[PDB]
Coordinates of C-alpha atoms and ligand atoms in Angstrom, one line a residue:
Chain R
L3 CA 21.8 10.3 21.1
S4 CA 19.4 11.2 24.0
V5 CA 15.5 10.8 24.0
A6 CA 13.0 12.1 26.3
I7 CA 9.4 11.0 26.4
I8 CA 7.0 13.9 27.8
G9 CA 3.6 12.2 29.1
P10 CA 3.7 9.6 31.6
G11 CA 0.6 8.1 30.0
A12 CA -0.2 4.7 28.3
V13 CA 1.4 5.7 25.3
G14 CA 4.2 7.5 27.1
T15 CA 5.3 5.0 29.4
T16 CA 5.2 2.2 26.8
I17 CA 7.5 4.2 24.5
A18 CA 9.6 5.2 27.2
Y19 CA 10.0 1.8 28.7
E20 CA 10.9 0.4 25.3
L21 CA 13.6 2.8 24.7
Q22 CA 15.2 2.1 28.1
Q23 CA 15.5 -1.6 27.3
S24 CA 17.9 -0.4 24.2
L25 CA 19.1 3.2 25.2
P26 CA 18.8 3.4 29.0
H27 CA 19.6 7.1 29.2
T28 CA 16.0 7.4 27.8
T29 CA 14.1 9.7 30.2
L30 CA 10.6 9.7 31.1
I31 CA 9.5 13.3 31.8
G32 CA 6.5 14.5 34.0
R33 CA 4.8 17.1 35.9
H34 CA 5.8 15.3 39.3
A35 CA 8.7 12.8 40.1
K36 CA 6.6 9.8 40.6
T37 CA 6.9 5.9 40.1
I38 CA 4.6 3.9 37.5
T39 CA 3.9 0.6 37.6
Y40 CA 4.0 -1.0 34.0
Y41 CA 2.8 -4.3 32.5
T42 CA 4.1 -5.1 29.0
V43 CA 1.3 -6.9 28.6
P44 CA -1.8 -8.1 31.0
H45 CA -0.6 -10.3 33.5
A46 CA 3.0 -9.4 33.2
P47 CA 5.6 -8.9 35.8
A48 CA 5.2 -5.5 37.0
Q49 CA 7.4 -3.0 36.5
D50 CA 8.7 0.2 38.0
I51 CA 9.1 3.1 35.5
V52 CA 11.0 6.3 37.0
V53 CA 9.6 9.5 35.9
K54 CA 11.6 12.4 36.6
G55 CA 9.8 16.0 36.9
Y56 CA 10.6 18.9 34.8
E57 CA 12.7 20.1 38.0
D58 CA 14.9 16.9 37.7
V59 CA 16.3 17.2 34.2
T60 CA 19.3 19.2 33.6
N61 CA 20.2 18.5 29.9
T62 CA 18.6 19.2 26.6
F63 CA 17.7 16.0 24.2
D64 CA 18.0 15.5 20.6
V65 CA 14.8 13.6 20.7
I66 CA 11.6 14.3 22.3
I67 CA 8.7 12.5 22.1
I68 CA 5.6 14.3 23.4
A69 CA 2.8 12.1 24.6
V70 CA 0.1 13.8 26.6
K71 CA -3.3 14.6 25.3
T72 CA -3.7 17.1 22.4
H73 CA -5.5 19.7 25.2
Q74 CA -2.3 19.1 27.1
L75 CA 0.2 20.2 24.4
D76 CA 0.0 23.9 24.9
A77 CA 1.0 23.3 28.7
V78 CA 4.3 21.5 27.4
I79 CA 5.5 23.8 24.9
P80 CA 7.3 26.5 27.4
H81 CA 9.1 23.8 29.0
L82 CA 11.1 22.9 25.4
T83 CA 13.0 25.8 25.9
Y84 CA 15.1 24.3 28.3
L85 CA 14.6 21.0 27.3
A86 CA 15.4 21.1 23.8
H87 CA 17.9 23.0 21.6
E88 CA 17.9 24.5 17.9
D89 CA 18.3 21.1 16.2
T90 CA 16.1 18.9 18.5
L91 CA 13.8 16.4 16.7
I92 CA 10.4 16.7 18.1
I93 CA 7.9 14.1 17.5
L94 CA 4.0 14.7 18.3
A95 CA 2.9 11.1 19.8
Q96 CA -1.1 12.4 19.8
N97 CA -4.1 11.6 18.1
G98 CA -5.8 13.8 15.2
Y99 CA -3.5 16.5 13.6
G100 CA -1.6 17.9 16.4
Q101 CA -0.9 22.0 17.0
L102 CA 2.2 21.6 15.0
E103 CA 2.5 25.2 14.5
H104 CA 2.2 26.1 18.0
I105 CA 6.0 24.8 18.7
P106 CA 8.6 27.3 17.6
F107 CA 11.2 24.7 16.4
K108 CA 12.6 23.7 13.2
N109 CA 12.1 19.6 13.3
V110 CA 8.7 19.0 14.8
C111 CA 6.9 15.9 13.4
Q112 CA 3.5 14.9 13.6
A113 CA 3.2 10.9 14.5
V114 CA 0.2 8.5 13.9
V115 CA 0.3 6.6 17.1
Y116 CA -0.9 3.0 16.8
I117 CA -0.1 1.8 20.5
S118 CA -3.2 0.5 22.7
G119 CA -3.1 0.9 26.5
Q120 CA -4.7 2.3 29.6
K121 CA -3.6 4.2 32.6
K122 CA -5.6 3.5 35.9
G123 CA -3.9 5.9 38.9
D124 CA -0.4 5.5 38.4
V125 CA -0.8 1.9 36.7
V126 CA -0.2 2.0 33.2
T127 CA -1.1 -1.4 31.5
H128 CA 0.1 -2.0 27.5
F129 CA -2.5 -4.4 25.5
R130 CA -0.9 -4.8 22.2
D131 CA 1.3 -2.7 19.2
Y132 CA 4.2 -0.6 19.5
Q133 CA 4.0 1.3 16.0
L134 CA 4.9 4.8 15.3
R135 CA 4.2 6.6 12.0
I136 CA 6.2 9.5 11.3
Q137 CA 7.2 11.5 8.5
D138 CA 10.4 10.2 6.5
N139 CA 13.3 12.4 6.5
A140 CA 17.2 12.4 7.7
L141 CA 16.4 12.8 11.5
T142 CA 13.5 10.2 11.7
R143 CA 15.7 7.8 9.9
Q144 CA 18.2 8.4 12.6
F145 CA 15.5 8.2 14.9
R146 CA 14.7 4.9 13.4
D147 CA 17.9 3.6 13.2
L148 CA 18.7 3.9 16.6
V149 CA 15.5 2.3 18.0
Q150 CA 16.4 -0.7 15.9
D151 CA 16.7 -3.1 18.5
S152 CA 13.8 -2.1 20.4
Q153 CA 10.3 -3.4 19.8
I154 CA 9.0 0.4 18.8
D155 CA 7.8 -0.2 15.7
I156 CA 8.9 2.9 13.4
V157 CA 7.0 3.2 10.0
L158 CA 8.5 6.2 8.0
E159 CA 5.9 7.5 5.6
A160 CA 6.6 9.5 2.2
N161 CA 3.7 11.2 3.1
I162 CA 2.5 11.0 6.7
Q163 CA -0.8 13.1 5.5
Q164 CA -2.5 10.1 4.3
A165 CA -1.5 8.3 7.6
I166 CA -2.8 11.1 9.6
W167 CA -5.7 11.3 7.6
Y168 CA -6.6 7.7 7.8
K169 CA -6.7 7.5 11.4
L170 CA -9.1 10.5 11.6
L171 CA -11.6 9.0 9.3
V172 CA -11.4 5.7 11.6
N173 CA -12.0 7.7 14.8
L174 CA -14.2 9.8 13.0
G175 CA -16.9 7.1 12.5
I176 CA -17.2 4.5 15.4
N177 CA -15.7 6.6 18.3
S178 CA -18.2 9.3 17.5
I179 CA -21.0 7.2 17.3
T180 CA -20.1 5.1 20.4
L181 CA -19.4 8.4 22.3
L182 CA -22.9 10.2 21.5
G183 CA -24.5 6.7 21.6
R184 CA -23.1 6.1 24.6
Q185 CA -22.9 2.2 23.7
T186 CA -20.4 -0.5 22.6
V187 CA -19.7 -1.3 18.9
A188 CA -23.1 -3.4 19.3
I189 CA -24.7 0.0 18.4
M190 CA -23.6 -0.6 14.9
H191 CA -26.2 -3.5 14.9
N192 CA -28.9 -0.5 14.3
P193 CA -29.0 -0.3 10.5
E194 CA -30.0 3.2 10.8
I195 CA -26.6 3.7 12.8
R196 CA -24.5 2.1 10.2
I197 CA -26.1 4.2 7.4
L198 CA -25.1 7.4 9.5
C199 CA -21.7 5.7 9.7
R200 CA -21.0 5.8 6.2
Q201 CA -22.6 9.1 5.6
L202 CA -20.1 10.4 8.5
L203 CA -17.0 8.5 7.0
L204 CA -18.2 9.9 3.5
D205 CA -18.3 13.5 4.9
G206 CA -14.8 13.2 6.5
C207 CA -13.6 11.5 3.1
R208 CA -14.9 14.5 1.5
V209 CA -12.9 16.7 3.5
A210 CA -9.8 14.5 2.9
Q211 CA -10.1 15.0 -0.7
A212 CA -9.9 18.7 -0.6
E213 CA -6.9 18.4 1.3
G214 CA -5.8 16.8 -1.5
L215 CA -5.5 13.1 -0.9
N216 CA -6.5 10.0 -2.5
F217 CA -9.6 8.9 -0.5
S218 CA -12.8 7.7 -2.3
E219 CA -16.1 5.8 -1.1
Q220 CA -13.8 2.7 -1.4
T221 CA -11.8 3.9 1.7
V222 CA -15.0 4.1 3.4
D223 CA -15.8 0.5 2.6
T224 CA -12.3 -0.5 4.2
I225 CA -13.0 1.6 7.2
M226 CA -16.8 0.1 7.8
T227 CA -15.0 -3.5 7.4
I228 CA -12.7 -2.9 10.4
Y229 CA -15.3 -1.6 12.4
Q230 CA -16.8 -5.2 12.1
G231 CA -13.7 -6.7 13.7
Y232 CA -14.1 -5.4 17.3
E251 CA -9.5 15.6 22.0
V252 CA -12.3 16.2 19.9
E253 CA -10.8 19.8 19.0
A254 CA -7.9 17.8 17.3
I255 CA -9.7 15.0 15.3
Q256 CA -13.4 15.8 14.6
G257 CA -12.7 19.7 15.0
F258 CA -9.7 19.5 12.7
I259 CA -12.0 17.8 10.2
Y260 CA -14.7 20.2 10.7
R261 CA -12.5 23.4 10.7
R262 CA -11.1 22.0 7.2
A263 CA -14.2 21.2 5.9
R264 CA -15.1 25.0 6.5
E265 CA -11.7 25.9 5.1
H266 CA -12.6 24.6 1.5
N267 CA -16.3 25.8 2.2
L268 CA -17.7 22.1 2.1
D269 CA -21.2 20.7 2.4
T270 CA -20.7 18.1 5.6
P271 CA -24.0 17.6 7.6
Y272 CA -23.6 14.5 9.1
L273 CA -20.1 16.0 10.6
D274 CA -21.6 19.3 11.5
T275 CA -24.3 17.2 13.3
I276 CA -21.6 14.9 15.3
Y277 CA -19.1 17.8 15.8
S278 CA -22.2 19.8 17.3
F279 CA -22.8 17.5 20.1
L280 CA -19.3 16.6 20.8
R281 CA -18.5 20.3 21.3
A282 CA -21.5 20.1 24.2
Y283 CA -19.5 17.2 25.7
Chain E
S4 CA -19.6 -14.4 -13.7
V5 CA -15.7 -13.8 -13.3
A6 CA -12.9 -16.1 -12.0
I7 CA -9.2 -15.1 -11.6
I8 CA -6.7 -18.1 -11.7
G9 CA -3.2 -17.5 -10.0
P10 CA -3.4 -15.5 -6.5
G11 CA -0.1 -13.7 -7.4
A12 CA 0.7 -9.9 -7.3
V13 CA -1.5 -9.3 -10.3
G14 CA -4.4 -12.1 -9.9
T15 CA -5.1 -10.5 -6.4
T16 CA -5.1 -7.0 -7.1
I17 CA -7.6 -7.6 -10.1
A18 CA -9.6 -10.0 -7.8
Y19 CA -9.9 -7.6 -4.7
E20 CA -10.9 -4.6 -7.2
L21 CA -13.4 -6.9 -8.7
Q22 CA -15.0 -8.1 -5.7
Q23 CA -15.7 -4.5 -4.7
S24 CA -18.1 -4.5 -7.5
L25 CA -18.7 -8.0 -8.3
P26 CA -18.7 -9.9 -5.1
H27 CA -19.1 -13.2 -6.8
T28 CA -15.4 -12.6 -8.5
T29 CA -13.5 -15.9 -7.6
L30 CA -9.8 -16.2 -7.1
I31 CA -8.4 -19.7 -7.7
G32 CA -5.3 -21.2 -7.1
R33 CA -3.8 -24.8 -6.4
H34 CA -5.1 -25.1 -3.0
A35 CA -7.7 -22.9 -0.5
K36 CA -5.8 -20.6 1.5
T37 CA -6.0 -16.5 2.7
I38 CA -3.9 -14.0 1.1
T39 CA -3.1 -11.0 3.0
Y40 CA -3.7 -8.0 0.4
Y41 CA -2.8 -4.3 0.5
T42 CA -4.0 -1.9 -1.9
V43 CA -0.7 0.2 -1.5
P44 CA 2.3 -0.3 0.7
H45 CA 1.7 1.0 4.5
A46 CA -2.0 0.6 3.9
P47 CA -4.4 -1.3 6.2
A48 CA -4.0 -5.0 5.6
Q49 CA -7.2 -7.0 4.3
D50 CA -7.6 -10.7 3.8
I51 CA -8.8 -12.2 0.8
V52 CA -9.5 -15.7 0.3
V53 CA -8.6 -18.5 -2.1
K54 CA -10.2 -21.4 -3.5
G55 CA -8.5 -24.4 -5.0
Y56 CA -9.1 -26.3 -8.3
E57 CA -11.0 -29.0 -6.1
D58 CA -13.0 -26.5 -4.3
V59 CA -14.4 -24.7 -7.4
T60 CA -17.4 -26.7 -8.6
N61 CA -18.8 -24.3 -11.5
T62 CA -18.1 -22.9 -14.9
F63 CA -17.3 -19.5 -15.5
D64 CA -18.3 -16.8 -18.0
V65 CA -15.0 -14.8 -17.9
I66 CA -11.6 -16.2 -16.8
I67 CA -8.5 -14.0 -15.9
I68 CA -5.1 -16.2 -16.1
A69 CA -2.8 -14.5 -14.1
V70 CA 0.0 -16.9 -13.6
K71 CA 3.6 -17.0 -14.8
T72 CA 4.2 -17.6 -18.3
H73 CA 6.2 -20.9 -17.5
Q74 CA 2.9 -21.7 -15.2
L75 CA 0.4 -21.6 -17.8
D76 CA 0.7 -25.3 -19.4
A77 CA -0.2 -26.3 -15.5
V78 CA -3.3 -24.3 -15.5
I79 CA -4.4 -25.4 -19.1
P80 CA -6.1 -28.7 -18.3
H81 CA -8.2 -27.2 -15.6
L82 CA -9.7 -24.7 -18.1
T83 CA -12.0 -27.7 -19.2
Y84 CA -13.6 -27.6 -15.9
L85 CA -14.1 -24.1 -15.1
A86 CA -14.9 -22.6 -18.5
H87 CA -17.8 -23.5 -21.1
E88 CA -17.2 -23.3 -25.0
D89 CA -18.5 -19.6 -24.9
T90 CA -16.1 -18.5 -22.0
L91 CA -13.8 -15.6 -22.7
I92 CA -10.3 -16.3 -21.7
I93 CA -8.5 -13.3 -20.9
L94 CA -4.4 -14.1 -20.5
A95 CA -3.1 -11.3 -18.1
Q96 CA 0.3 -12.2 -18.8
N97 CA 3.5 -10.4 -20.2
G98 CA 5.5 -11.8 -23.5
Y99 CA 3.5 -12.9 -26.1
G100 CA 2.8 -16.1 -28.2
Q101 CA 1.2 -18.7 -25.6
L102 CA -2.3 -17.9 -26.8
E103 CA -2.1 -20.7 -29.1
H104 CA -1.5 -22.9 -26.2
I105 CA -5.0 -22.7 -24.9
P106 CA -7.5 -24.6 -26.6
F107 CA -10.5 -22.0 -26.5
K108 CA -12.6 -19.8 -29.1
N109 CA -12.3 -16.6 -26.8
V110 CA -8.6 -16.1 -26.0
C111 CA -7.5 -12.5 -25.6
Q112 CA -3.6 -11.5 -24.4
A113 CA -3.9 -8.8 -21.8
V114 CA -1.0 -5.9 -21.8
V115 CA -1.0 -5.6 -18.0
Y116 CA -0.1 -2.5 -16.3
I117 CA -0.5 -3.7 -12.4
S118 CA 2.6 -3.2 -10.3
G119 CA 3.1 -4.8 -7.1
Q120 CA 4.9 -7.8 -5.6
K121 CA 4.1 -11.0 -3.6
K122 CA 6.2 -12.1 -0.9
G123 CA 4.9 -15.5 0.9
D124 CA 0.9 -15.0 1.0
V125 CA 1.4 -11.2 1.1
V126 CA 0.7 -9.4 -1.9
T127 CA 1.5 -5.6 -1.9
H128 CA -0.2 -3.7 -5.0
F129 CA 2.2 -0.5 -5.6
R130 CA 0.2 1.4 -8.4
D131 CA -2.0 1.4 -11.5
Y132 CA -5.0 -1.0 -12.6
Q133 CA -4.9 -0.8 -16.0
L134 CA -5.5 -3.9 -18.6
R135 CA -5.3 -3.4 -22.0
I136 CA -7.2 -6.0 -24.4
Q137 CA -8.0 -6.0 -28.1
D138 CA -11.6 -4.6 -28.7
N139 CA -14.4 -6.9 -29.6
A140 CA -18.0 -7.9 -28.7
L141 CA -17.1 -9.7 -26.0
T142 CA -14.4 -7.4 -24.3
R143 CA -16.8 -4.5 -24.9
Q144 CA -19.2 -6.5 -23.0
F145 CA -16.5 -7.1 -20.2
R146 CA -15.6 -3.7 -19.9
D147 CA -19.0 -2.6 -18.9
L148 CA -19.5 -5.2 -16.5
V149 CA -16.7 -4.1 -14.1
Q150 CA -17.3 0.0 -15.1
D151 CA -18.1 0.0 -11.4
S152 CA -14.4 -1.2 -10.2
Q153 CA -11.3 0.8 -10.7
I154 CA -9.9 -1.8 -13.1
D155 CA -8.9 0.3 -16.2
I156 CA -9.6 -1.7 -19.1
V157 CA -8.4 -0.2 -22.2
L158 CA -9.8 -1.4 -25.1
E159 CA -7.3 -1.4 -28.3
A160 CA -8.4 -1.1 -31.8
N161 CA -5.2 -3.5 -32.5
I162 CA -3.7 -5.0 -29.4
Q163 CA -0.6 -6.0 -31.0
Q164 CA 0.7 -2.6 -30.8
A165 CA 0.4 -2.3 -27.1
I166 CA 1.7 -6.1 -26.7
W167 CA 5.1 -5.2 -28.3
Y168 CA 5.9 -1.9 -27.2
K169 CA 5.9 -3.9 -23.6
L170 CA 7.8 -6.6 -25.1
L171 CA 10.6 -3.9 -26.1
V172 CA 10.6 -2.1 -22.7
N173 CA 11.1 -5.7 -21.2
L174 CA 14.1 -6.3 -23.8
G175 CA 15.8 -3.6 -23.1
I176 CA 16.4 -3.2 -19.1
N177 CA 15.8 -6.9 -17.9
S178 CA 18.3 -8.4 -20.5
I179 CA 21.1 -6.3 -19.1
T180 CA 20.7 -6.5 -15.7
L181 CA 19.7 -10.2 -15.8
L182 CA 22.7 -11.1 -17.6
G183 CA 24.9 -8.5 -16.0
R184 CA 23.7 -9.9 -12.5
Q185 CA 23.2 -6.3 -11.2
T186 CA 20.8 -3.8 -10.7
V187 CA 19.5 -0.9 -12.8
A188 CA 22.5 0.6 -11.2
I189 CA 24.7 -1.0 -14.4
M190 CA 23.3 1.3 -16.9
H191 CA 25.5 3.8 -15.7
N192 CA 28.3 2.6 -18.0
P193 CA 28.5 4.5 -21.6
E194 CA 28.9 0.9 -23.1
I195 CA 25.9 -0.6 -21.3
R196 CA 23.4 2.3 -22.4
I197 CA 24.7 1.8 -26.0
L198 CA 24.3 -1.7 -26.1
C199 CA 21.0 -1.2 -24.4
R200 CA 20.0 1.0 -27.7
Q201 CA 21.3 -1.7 -30.1
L202 CA 19.6 -4.3 -28.4
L203 CA 16.5 -2.3 -28.5
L204 CA 17.0 -1.2 -32.3
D205 CA 16.9 -5.1 -32.9
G206 CA 14.0 -5.7 -31.0
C207 CA 12.3 -2.8 -33.2
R208 CA 13.4 -4.7 -36.2
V209 CA 11.5 -7.7 -35.5
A210 CA 8.6 -5.8 -34.8
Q211 CA 9.0 -3.9 -38.2
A212 CA 9.1 -7.5 -39.4
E213 CA 5.9 -8.6 -37.8
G214 CA 4.3 -5.5 -39.3
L215 CA 4.9 -2.7 -36.8
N216 CA 5.4 0.6 -37.1
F217 CA 8.0 0.9 -34.7
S218 CA 11.3 3.0 -35.4
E219 CA 14.1 4.8 -34.4
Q220 CA 11.8 7.2 -32.3
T221 CA 10.2 4.2 -30.1
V222 CA 13.6 3.2 -28.9
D223 CA 13.9 6.9 -28.1
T224 CA 10.9 7.0 -25.8
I225 CA 11.9 3.5 -24.2
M226 CA 15.6 5.0 -23.3
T227 CA 13.6 8.0 -22.0
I228 CA 11.4 5.9 -19.8
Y229 CA 14.6 4.0 -18.6
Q230 CA 15.4 7.4 -17.1
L250 CA 11.8 -16.8 -15.6
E251 CA 9.6 -15.3 -18.4
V252 CA 12.9 -15.2 -20.7
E253 CA 11.5 -18.1 -23.0
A254 CA 8.3 -15.7 -23.4
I255 CA 9.7 -12.3 -23.9
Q256 CA 13.6 -12.9 -25.1
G257 CA 12.5 -16.1 -26.3
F258 CA 9.5 -14.8 -28.2
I259 CA 11.3 -12.1 -30.1
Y260 CA 14.3 -14.3 -30.9
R261 CA 11.9 -17.0 -32.5
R262 CA 10.2 -14.8 -34.6
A263 CA 13.6 -13.1 -35.5
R264 CA 14.2 -16.5 -37.2
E265 CA 10.8 -16.4 -38.7
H266 CA 11.6 -13.4 -40.9
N267 CA 15.2 -14.4 -41.4
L268 CA 16.9 -11.4 -39.4
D269 CA 19.7 -10.6 -38.7
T270 CA 19.9 -9.7 -34.8
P271 CA 23.6 -9.8 -33.5
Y272 CA 22.5 -8.1 -30.0
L273 CA 19.3 -10.1 -29.7
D274 CA 21.2 -13.3 -30.5
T275 CA 24.3 -12.6 -28.0
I276 CA 21.7 -11.9 -25.3
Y277 CA 19.1 -14.5 -25.6
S278 CA 22.1 -17.2 -25.9
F279 CA 23.1 -16.1 -22.3
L280 CA 19.5 -16.5 -21.0
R281 CA 18.9 -19.7 -22.6
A282 CA 21.9 -21.1 -21.1
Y283 CA 21.1 -20.1 -17.5
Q284 CA 17.7 -21.6 -17.9
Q285 CA 19.2 -24.9 -18.9
Ligands
LIG301 N1 -4.9 3.1 23.6 C1 -4.4 4.4 23.8 O1 -4.4 5.1 24.6 C2 -4.1 5.1 22.5 C3 -3.9 4.7 21.6 C4 -3.8 5.5 20.0 C5 -3.2 6.7 20.2 N2 -3.5 7.3 21.2 C6 -3.2 8.6 21.4 O2 -1.9 8.8 22.1 C7 -2.0 10.1 23.2 C8 -1.5 9.4 24.4 O3 -2.8 9.2 25.3 P1 -2.5 8.2 26.7 O4 -3.5 7.1 26.4 O5 -1.1 8.3 27.2 O6 -3.4 9.5 27.4 P2 -2.8 9.4 29.1 O7 -2.6 7.8 29.7 O8 -3.9 10.1 30.2 O9 -1.6 10.0 29.2 C9 -1.4 11.5 29.6 C10 -0.1 11.3 30.8 O10 0.4 12.9 30.5 C11 0.6 13.4 32.0 N3 0.6 14.9 31.7 C12 -0.6 15.7 31.3 N4 -0.2 16.6 31.2 C13 1.1 16.9 31.4 C14 2.2 18.3 31.5 N5 1.6 19.7 31.2 N6 3.3 17.9 31.2 C15 3.8 16.3 31.6 N7 3.1 15.4 31.6 C16 1.5 15.6 31.5 C17 -0.4 13.0 32.9 O11 -0.3 13.1 34.1 P3 -1.2 12.9 35.1 O12 -1.5 11.2 35.4 O13 -0.8 13.4 36.3 O14 -2.8 13.7 34.5 C18 -0.9 11.4 32.1 O15 0.0 10.4 33.0 C19 -3.3 10.5 23.4 O16 -3.4 12.0 22.5 C20 -4.3 9.4 22.6 O17 -5.0 10.2 21.7 C21 -3.7 6.5 22.6
LIG302 N1 4.6 -5.8 -11.0 C1 3.9 -7.1 -11.4 O1 4.2 -7.8 -10.6 C2 3.6 -7.0 -12.7 C3 3.4 -5.9 -13.9 C4 3.1 -5.8 -14.9 C5 3.1 -7.4 -15.5 N2 3.4 -8.5 -14.9 C6 2.8 -9.5 -15.4 O2 2.1 -10.1 -14.8 C7 1.9 -11.6 -14.7 C8 1.6 -12.0 -13.4 O3 2.7 -11.9 -12.3 P1 2.3 -11.7 -11.1 O4 3.3 -10.4 -10.8 O5 1.2 -11.9 -10.5 O6 3.4 -12.9 -10.4 P2 3.2 -13.8 -9.0 O7 2.4 -12.9 -8.1 O8 4.4 -14.9 -9.2 O9 2.0 -14.7 -9.9 C9 2.1 -16.0 -9.8 C10 1.0 -16.8 -9.0 O10 0.3 -17.5 -9.6 C11 0.4 -18.8 -8.9 N3 0.3 -20.0 -9.8 C12 1.5 -20.7 -10.5 N4 1.2 -21.8 -10.8 C13 -0.1 -22.1 -10.7 C14 -0.9 -23.1 -11.2 N5 -0.7 -24.2 -12.0 N6 -2.4 -23.2 -10.7 C15 -2.7 -21.9 -10.1 N7 -2.3 -21.1 -9.7 C16 -0.6 -21.1 -9.9 C17 1.1 -19.0 -7.9 O11 1.0 -19.3 -6.7 P3 2.0 -20.2 -5.6 O12 3.3 -19.4 -6.1 O13 1.6 -19.8 -4.2 O14 1.8 -21.5 -6.1 C18 1.3 -17.1 -7.9 O15 0.8 -16.5 -6.6 C19 3.2 -11.9 -14.9 O16 3.6 -12.7 -16.0 C20 4.1 -10.5 -15.2 O17 5.0 -10.4 -16.1 C21 3.3 -8.2 -13.5

């Protein structure tokens, strides 16, 4: 079984490297043929990862992992014509709820990525975690069985909706405040901010209820507790659009999204 | 004040949900340690601390014992330090006939509908948060106390109904798979299902002798639902069968093997 990983980024390289250690035919595809300096962890022996451009690949793949930014997806899709066949499993290694409908293939699955890493130039440094949460089906089980030996942790989900939406809420809270406030997590020291955070979470959590998921105020409590231990259109934009889809009243979400739209 | 003894699957689950509303709820075990709790599988992990008997210094108004039936006697001597004379003790166990072992005024058997498992120091809750208790002044007071938690307290007019119903449910499926040393997959044999019915009719005959309205329809529902603590479940029913001088051939045959295993 052949595997391709579109997107030579922090997530893409980390996945591509770990799969090449199990199934070496795993191909990392980018826009240009380049070489990426990769660290499995900080202070690890530097490794060169082969990145082959679209023009270099001549074969179709059974499993394609798209790990580009959510606003970069539309640029990747046209290349799926020659990169994929009819029954190719397409996995979106992206944040938020990706544009699943934009991809004209039968087997398209949204993945919840929990892989922390950064890219500076062509030097990718991985920090921790190798987890990918995907919807449980026959092909995602086959892909799970294939990456048995790799430390890539594939978590098959009965309903990936709950996994997707939970991370949506997590990013909704702390990342919106840190971005708009232009500070670290220490901005949560302000009592007014913490109130906003819960209200912001409750807004998104209210949208999650409308989508049919079992998220209550206790979900907010657990997420707020997580914050004590430390792509807008696809994240906040998605929660916002579904808030209008159900004609909901989410003022805190509306305000955050209004400023994030203004960059 | 509420204290839960036994940091297992049930004990931790009750502890977690009550601590959300009643922060001073104390989870008590043999020794101090940390339990890794999951509200549901694949949910974010949450730590919950446990105090040992040596660490607990005060008495509690309400105590919830959530240990195995065969582990109750080891808990009993500690109750003279963790409780006062007016303390309500709730026995969150399966089976029956163990309320007499607890030397206190307010002892109530709880029909526990809280599913989950404990692997090492990791508790994974599955579904439901229901406790069924006999209705009285103290339980009514306990129900309103935990009204803000999602612990479902169902106050029954006559708890003997729910206790024995759960007894029969345990009697039918456990006994066969336990004696046959196989999974639920053993129920595919026509002889086994017929036997499973006859075993239930035996237990139903014991329940009828105890003054319950159980009939051939009660068995039919359990057979439809179908589509160690043995001394407190099969052992209890067998004991009461002798008390009423009943002829329960299927119950005797099963229990004699289960009893022998334990020796
Ligand atoms: N810690 C994390 O980074 C983290 C954690 C959890 C989830 N995620 C999510 O996972 C996804 C991966 O993000 P990331 O951190 O890998 O971002 P990143 O490091 O910037 O990855 C983007 C990479 O894709 C390449 N690329 C861009 N457009 C392309 C195209 N049309 N065709 C082929 N390759 C293209 C870029 O190459 P150039 O360098 O030439 O632009 C860049 O190397 C993100 O959506 C993120 O939200 C990330
Ligand atoms: N799905 C379910 O779990 C489920 C569903 C319905 C009903 N029930 C009923 O609920 C009851 C609770 O079972 P469970 O699932 O919680 O089993 P469990 O997970 O094994 O709980 C037993 C816990 O009690 C602790 N313990 C044992 N002896 C003790 C002592 N002397 N002092 C203090 N703590 C002690 C044990 O800790 P260590 O082992 O670490 O010492 C263990 O963690 C059972 O009788 C069961 O029939 C269970």
